[PDB]
């Protein structure tokens, strides 16, 4: 399974994610695309001669590649629709309020304005404070360490996203200061942190 | 959603992996460990004050960490029993036979001896041949590019594992030769490729 | 040779570093250590059976390894002394003053307090301002991109160090904001940026 | 300084490369290019407004960039001529002969055919043998670990290059087999290992 931990950043909480049992795989083939599914849900695709269906010349998914594949599976007759939400998941947010977690003690529940909406995320970073601009890994974001941010819940209260630190953003070497990263007012709430 | 493709080493086929949207999540809390489950299956754990339950000072799961966590969730009253498989997933294999794929043309179906068992994997690498010792990414292995090797099937015939190339093993720069990597007889079938 | 360039963070200035060409190497051998020198200067060492002289089990020099090697070359009779400073080269600095470069136009000359001393560094980053706390790569620091910060000079005025940006500090993905990184007052002038 | 050590691949010999303490730097300015030199040798260049002199939009030197810079420093009046060696440094070589090192015991002196020439390199890798095709890091090559291969000498006999192993070529994880890498006959002597 997977394990995420970060004392000074989020808190002295370990997060174990487990992949559940998987049934036998089924393969529905049509033309050059084979739809593979486990149970009733589709769990993947094997599209052949992909080179003549998409520009594939460390291949990383892009809104345009997904479009190409979507176009191909559709041309094959399948109706399933690939996740095509390429909205930035790492964004600049503003910490409106910070309050004590009702029953955690070293954790705070924050209300972070992220422009498109306001997120309630639980954070244990000792350096976080209201009035700060920070980068939040919204639900869906994929952490360098592997973990995928989900609509979690920390000891009772819901948490939708994570306040990032240098490490979280991908910094190779461990920084002297390990709390979360505080951006200058220069940054704009709602804007993507990455280009 | 994961995407694998490597015209040179595997073949001109793109493997898309999808995780079917998980329903609601339920949280059963007892002491410092919260058992989280989706449907009836447990899908994870949030163990708090993990630092005083395990030695957590790029945290990667080890038989000993899992033991620590298992001891903690049990002490909390839960009966679920965490996984393991720490058996090496990248191993040295021997290509016993190589035959033409009944209906693929540029793909071959191989029978690879991996000591503990014999695997039938489909490979399109132009340089692969019978009599070669090679490194196979068995089912379960996690490819640097993200994808997780599964009990697949390529155009009809089953494929359990993947014959690796320099890139697949994690080589930073693209090598001149892009087929799969052929090891010298020095290597032992069944042994892990990594330390 | 190597080439450094970072319009947005330092200025429209291409940095070419060049290694002059050496010649004849001489080898003075004593016991297990061979002192190699070019001209009259020592340019290296080959210490044999190093395993029984130091703990070498991506080997990176540490104050302690250098000590071990120093002890060995001395025990061999050589008097040369290895440079073992190890003082942090990436530190938090305070921008005291910012003035226009006498004849550059898009560059500013800054006076940065770095606790142990005050450094005059020339910077073209558009977002830098007096009153800001920033991380400076002092003379000697080794930039991820290869270049080694030296007691430079930009169009006339001397520059001892470089004001860093996300990229410079080792961030994998290009950030939306490309100027230099502005730290919060939380940071302490003179302290190392890295742990 | 750098450090290199591969007990199993190269030998129980630690190589220290030392950066000879350079005195002052001198700056000769003409137009937009400043020629910087240490002693009498030129050690670099700072060409300003480089964007309007070359196409600079992880900047890595190319025969064309060097041409652009060369054209600029010349237009400024300087006569120095940029080096820039672009011949592959990591190549496929053939181990013609392998003999015992006259006085090292666990080292062998090899005669490696590299097509353009024959190199005498000293190697301690236990798995190396005559008749093998291997990848050699010729003089000039830059090892991932930092060190720069030079016209060395190991306990008496000269060594021009290094026989590489997985680690040396940049493999992230430590391999089970740590000797040098033996290529299949498929590889061609003299050809670059990297694309």
CATH of the domain at D64: 3.30.1940.10
Contact D102, D157 (CB under 8 A): yes
Q: Which residues lie across from A118 on neighbouring strands?
A: A113
Domain span including residue D125:
2-17+87-195
Instruction: Among A16, A21, A69, select the one facing B16 at the smallest CB separation.
Output: A69
Q: How far apart are CA B46 and CA B29, in angstroms?
A: 9
**Helix, strand or coil, per DSSP, at residue C40:** coil
| Number of independent structural domains in chain A | 2
Question: Which residues, including other chains, have CB under 8 Å from residue C140's CB and lie 6 or more apart?
Answer: C85, C89, C148, C149
Neighbours of D67 (CB within 10 A): 13
Question: Which letter does DSSP use for residue D8 in this model?
Answer: T
Q: How far apart are CA D44 and CA D57, in angstroms?
A: 21
Neighbours of C124 (CB within 10 A): 23
Same structural domain, A102 and A45 = no
Same structural domain, A140 and A178 = yes
Judging contacts by C-beta atoms under 8 Å, the chain B residues touching residue D177 are 186-187
Q: How far apart are CA A22 and CA A39, in angstroms?
A: 9
**Helix, strand or coil, per DSSP, at residue A73:** helix
Does residue A18 sit at the C interface (CB-CB below 8 Å)? no
Instruction: Identify the domain boundary among B65, B86, B107.
Output: B86
Hey, what are A187's tokens?
Answer: 């940054």
In angstroms, the first-to-last Cα distance of chain B is 30
Resolution of the experimentally solved model in angstroms: 2.7
Does residue A157 sit at the B interface (CB-CB below 8 Å)? no
Instruction: Identify the domain boundary among C56, C86, C116.
Output: C86
Q: How far apart are CA C151 and CA B144, in angstroms?
A: 41
Cβ distance B44 to A15 less than 8 Å, yes or no, reads yes
Same structural domain, C66 and C154 = no
Judging contacts by C-beta atoms under 8 Å, the chain A residues touching residue B50 are 5, 12-14
Instruction: Identify the domain boundary among B69, B86, B103.
Output: B86
Does residue B157 sit at the A interface (CB-CB below 8 Å)? no
What is the CATH classification number for the domain harbouring A122?
A: 2.40.50.140
C-alpha distance from residue D127 to each of B150, D10, D98, D166 (Å)? 35, 11, 11, 13
Q: How far apart are CA B164 and CA B87, in angstroms?
A: 18
Instruction: Among D132, D179, D194, select the one facing B176 at the smallest CB separation.
Output: D194
Q: How far apart are CA D12 and CA C69, in angstroms?
A: 14
* Burial label, D195 (beta-carbon count in 10 A; 0-12, 13-18, 19+): exposed
Does residue A131 sit at the C interface (CB-CB below 8 Å)? no
Does residue B170 sit at the D interface (CB-CB below 8 Å)? yes
Q: Which residues lie across from B135 on neighbouring strands?
A: B92
**C129-167 burial, b if ≥16 CB within 10 A, otherwise e?**
eeebbbbbbbbebebebebebbebbbbebebbbbbbbbb
Same structural domain, C66 and C147 = no
Contact D174, B194 (CB under 8 A): yes
Q: Which residues lie across from A42 on neighbouring strands?
A: A37
The helix (H) or strand (E) run that includes residue C173 is none
Q: How far apart are CA C136 and CA C149, in angstroms?
A: 10
Q: How far apart are CA A97 and CA D46, in angstroms?
A: 49
Which residue from C minimizes the CA distance to D27?
C153
C-alpha distance from residue D25 to each of A28, C22, C139 (Å)? 70, 18, 13
Hey, what are D155's tokens?
Answer: 């306990």
Percent helix, strand, coil in chain C, to 5, is: 10, 40, 50
Neighbours of C40 (CB within 10 A): 6
Q: Residue D115: which of D100, D136, D101 has the closest Cα?
A: D136
Cβ distance D69 to C29 less than 8 Å, yes or no, reads no
Query: What DSSP assignment string belongs to A15-50?
Result: EEE-PPP---EEEEEETTEEEEEETTEEEEEEEETG
Same structural domain, C44 and C119 = no
Same structural domain, D191 and D97 = yes
Rg of chain D on CA atoms, in Å: 20
Q: Which residues lie across from B6 on neighbouring strands?
A: B11
Instruction: Among C1, C29, C65, select the one facing D61 at the smallest CB separation.
Output: C1
Instruction: Among A34, A44, A151, select the one facing B18 at the smallest CB separation.
Output: A44
Cβ distance B25 to A153 less than 8 Å, yes or no, reads yes
Neighbours of D102 (CB within 10 A): 11
Q: How far apart are CA B135 and CA B181, in angstroms?
A: 7
Q: Residue D36: which of D49, D21, D46, D48 has the closest Cα?
A: D46
In angstroms, the first-to-last Cα distance of chain D is 30
Q: How far apart are CA D143 and CA D153, in angstroms?
A: 18
Same structural domain, A91 and A173 = yes
**Helix, strand or coil, per DSSP, at residue B82:** coil
Hey, what are B151's tokens?
Answer: 């009990």
C-alpha distance from residue A186 to each of A85, A92, A133, C124 (Å)? 28, 11, 9, 17
Pairing between β-strand A90-100 and β-strand A151-154 as defined by DSSP bridges: unpaired
Chains D and A touch (3+ CB pairs under 8 A): no
SS (H, E, C) D153-166: EECCEEEECEECCC
C-alpha C110, offset from chain centre: 19
Does residue A42 sit at the B interface (CB-CB below 8 Å)? yes
Best residue in A2, A3, A41 to probe B by mutation, most B CBs within 10 Å? A3
Q: Phi first, then psi: what are they for D136, rounded to 5°?
A: -105, 140
Contact A143, A195 (CB under 8 A): no
The residue count for chain A:
195
Same structural domain, B120 and B168 = yes
C-alpha B11, offset from chain centre: 19
Same structural domain, B188 and B99 = yes
Q: Residue B101: which of B122, B131, B74 has the closest Cα?
A: B122
Q: In this structure, is the dihedral angle defined by the CA atoms of residues A152, A156, A162 and A166, taken in order, positive or negative?
A: negative
Q: Residue C22: which of C4, C44, C3 has the closest Cα?
A: C44
**Helix, strand or coil, per DSSP, at residue B118:** strand
C-alpha A116, offset from chain centre: 16
**B176-187 burial, b if ≥16 CB within 10 A, otherwise e?**
bbbbbbbbeeeb
Same structural domain, A107 and A164 = yes
Method underlying the structure? X-ray
Q: How far apart are CA B112 and CA B127, in angstroms?
A: 15
Q: Where are the strands (E) in chain A, listed by range?
A: 2-6, 11-17, 25-30, 33-38, 41-48, 90-100, 108-113, 118-123, 133-137, 151-154, 157-160, 162-163, 182-183
C-alpha distance from residue A75 to each of A53, A55, A69, A72 (Å)? 11, 17, 10, 5
Contact C134, C128 (CB under 8 A): yes
C-alpha distance from residue D130 to each of A108, A192, D13, D99, D190 (Å)? 66, 57, 23, 9, 17
Same structural domain, B114 and B74 = no
Contact C111, C97 (CB under 8 A): yes
Q: Phi first, then psi: what are they for D176, rounded to 5°?
A: -60, -50
Same structural domain, C91 and C71 = no
C-alpha distance from residue D91 to each of A27, D95, D119, D177, D188 (Å)? 44, 13, 12, 21, 9
Cβ distance D46 to C154 less than 8 Å, yes or no, reads yes
Q: Residue A108: which of A94, A92, A121, A93 has the closest Cα?
A: A121
Best residue in B16, B37, B78 to probe A by mutation, most A CBs within 10 Å? B16
The helix (H) or strand (E) run that includes residue D63 is helix D63-75
Q: In this structure, is the dihedral angle defined by the CA atoms of residues B176, B178, B179 and B182, taken in order, positive or negative?
A: positive
Question: Which residues, including other chains, have CB under 8 Å from residue A160's CB and lie 6 or more apart?
Answer: A119, A120, A121, A138, A139, A151, A152
Which residue from B minimizes the CA distance to A60?
B3
Q: How far apart are CA C135 and CA C165, in angstroms?
A: 8
Q: How far apart are CA B146 and CA B17, in angstroms?
A: 10
C-alpha B58, offset from chain centre: 19
Q: Residue A181: which of A92, A113, A75 has the closest Cα?
A: A92
Query: What DSSP assignment string belongs to B11-78?
Result: EEEEEEE--------EEEEETTEEEEEETTEEEEEEEETGGGTS--------HHHHHHHHHHHHHTT-
Q: Which residues lie across from A35 on neighbouring strands?
A: A28, A45
Contact D140, D85 (CB under 8 A): yes
Q: Residue A160: which of A194, A114, A128 has the closest Cα?
A: A114
Q: In this structure, is the dihedral angle defined by the CA atoms of residues A30, A34, A38 and A43, taken in order, positive or negative?
A: negative
Q: Residue C166: which of A195, D121, B49 has the closest Cα?
A: A195
């Amino acid at each position: 399974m997977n394990l995420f931990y970060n004392k000074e950043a989020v808190g002295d909480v370990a997060f174990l994610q487990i992949n559940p049992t998987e049934g036998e795989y089924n393969y529905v083939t049509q033309g050059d695309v084979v739809e593979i599914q486990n149970d009733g849900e589709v769990v993947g695709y094997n599209i052949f001669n992909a080179s003549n269906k998409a520009t594939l010349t460390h291949i990383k998914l892009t809104e345009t590649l997904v479009q190409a594949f979507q176009k191909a599976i559709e041309a094959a007759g399948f109706t399933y629709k690939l996740d095509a939400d390429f909205t930035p998941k790492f964004v600049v947010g503003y910490v409106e309020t910070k309050d004590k977690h009702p029953d955690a003690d070293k954790l705070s529940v924050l209300s972070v304005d992220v422009a498109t909406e306001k997120l309630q995320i639980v954070c244990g970073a000792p350096n976080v404070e209201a009035g700060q601009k920070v980068v939040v890994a919204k639900v869906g974001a994929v952490m360098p360490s592997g973990m995928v941010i989900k609509d979690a819940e920390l000891r009772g209260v819901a948490s939708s996203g994570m306040i990032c630190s240098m490490k979280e953003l991908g910094l190779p070497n461990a920084p002297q200061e390990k709390g979360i990263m505080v951006l200058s007012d220069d940054y704009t709430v709602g804007q993507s942190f990455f280009e």
